[PDB]
DNA sequence: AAGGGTCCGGACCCT
DNA sequence: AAGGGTCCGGACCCT
């Protein structure tokens, strides 16, 4: 299907909220910590050697001058998160989130209409905004190569708005399918953008040197592929598609192989409104008695504020466990009168526990 | 909720579309068949004998009149299954459909706009369209009377309509909620409609002999609570909460309790369109050998056509054996280039029975 | 960590 | 029979 896709990328989002909320931590190494670990870090505390998940205490001796805000809260990352997807949803309305940091957008329907009220008397002059992947030549005469020149330049238009209206810096990255757009945003990854004209999309897909690193495969169908002997890209392109149905299944098979080949039909979805606002907490094995109920009620007391503040309301309320030893759940459709709220709320949720490091309340089913 | 619910049961369907098929059929005990079960009969055969699930031969005997048109394809009775539920859809959007016989539609909001276009000087003539349960006497004074008996005089409007557009006869039920209209519904089954009045809930749900007759409670669920004892309606409704919460889980215990008496907040949904087009046939361990491809094949065919007509398109594809001891399912992703066709389809097909009395093939995942 | 999303196969219900 | 629908808990993915 010749699409434009675009995949906006924020540059360590929880950092750049924290530095845009404290302007004194500009041009300071910021570390976002969430318990024992650095979850995000600014590139000035990257440059001094700060990376994703590390301890934060060596973080606090690699780089002394380490200020670290806690990020437990995600309240304040969600808004600007939802604020970002807004602004993007005003050049199209369907866009995809995958996380608080990343959104997708087809740009196809766009592009089109602007090819259209254009008159090829200046097609000489359709630019490229940002950089060509592996320097490939644009031929203004191929149209594929035209449709995502477009794309590139309605991105450069989405970053600038983004800096311009919520001050927040990002990359791009726009290609034919939301694999290469993701796989090509990060060639250049401070506040940069990137194309992927379809002739160098086998370099891309063989730059990667680990097949984790795709989108879609995790531990598991590594671990799968591992074990069958596939570590490189073209391993799984040239592996027995009959095996791989036979010890993966059919559909991870078939997606998997055809990803190895940067091959993804996938169509990007509006995410829309959320489906679910959970709450968490984790400890050293700190719950061993029911007294887990003092921590479900204050994980409810928390969710109820962001519930109450949606506006649409949960029917089913789910109480996920993580036991040291994987993460089992139980759920229960919410009573209508508590729908219409803490000691109700806590019986079911503690029935739910009876029957079943990590406990979490989750409000889905939102009518 | 203040809600006015109305169900729509159609008398025998299937033979109400057969004998509108062949006119020549009408005033003739007439029996669908399907296999060797007679599934629906006209009320000329039930007098005469004939009963829904019966041996086509018994039936035969009971009333040598008995012509039984086959009804294993039901495509024509779909087709005006979805012109009776288009019909209602015009009078209120929101229509659920169970079945192919039965639909719930909630005219609260169509009650309120006529009760708002009325004067109060002539409430004193808000009179009923059709039974009232148990003779209740009618309150023209109490609110939630004269919206129920608004819903009466929309409920005889749809009927009339189905039949002066359709030429369908039908049975009407209108309460506040769900489980209540389709239990109003039926008693005064030949082609008439009831009202349930609030003061006489208890009396409908005490009229039932089993659980079993309550609509959300099927055979598992009436074992469990006939092994616990419970036989009555008031048996279930005077049941300790807690026991049937740690028997049957909190989800079910609280909704079967509260249908036990009359309570259900069920919202009636917008059915809309299909979300799955399915095919099978019954067999007598006729499928011993993979020869069973041929009946796949047969399956795949007959759906093919009926998804070409909607014009909606299947994404996953879906096989459901019986064995002979219940039933399993393997489901795979429809490649992209088959969604754009026999061979494809069958060899997919194959390879998921060959990973797992009736074979299935089902078409969802429509976009 | 601290969230958040689809897919899937079964159980159960209904006609 | 011959269809058709939600609920659920887990696996797996992503940030
Ligand atoms: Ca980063
Ligand atoms: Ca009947």
Redo the contacts between chains.
Sequence with gaps: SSRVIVHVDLDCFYAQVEMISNPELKDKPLGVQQKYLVVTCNYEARKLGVKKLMNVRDAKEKCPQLVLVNGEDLTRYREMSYKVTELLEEFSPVVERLGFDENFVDLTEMVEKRLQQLQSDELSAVTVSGHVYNNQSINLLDVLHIRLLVGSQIAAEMREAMYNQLGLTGCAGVASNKLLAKLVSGVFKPNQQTVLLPESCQHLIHSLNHIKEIPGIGYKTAKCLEALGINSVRDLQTFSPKIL?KEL???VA??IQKLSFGED?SPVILSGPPQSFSEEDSFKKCSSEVEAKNKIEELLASLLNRVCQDGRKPHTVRLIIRRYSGRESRQ??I??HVIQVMTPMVD?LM??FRNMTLLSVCFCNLK
Tied chains: 1, 2.
């Design positions: 149905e299944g059919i559909s078939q997606r039909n229960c459709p009573p209508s079911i029935k739910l």
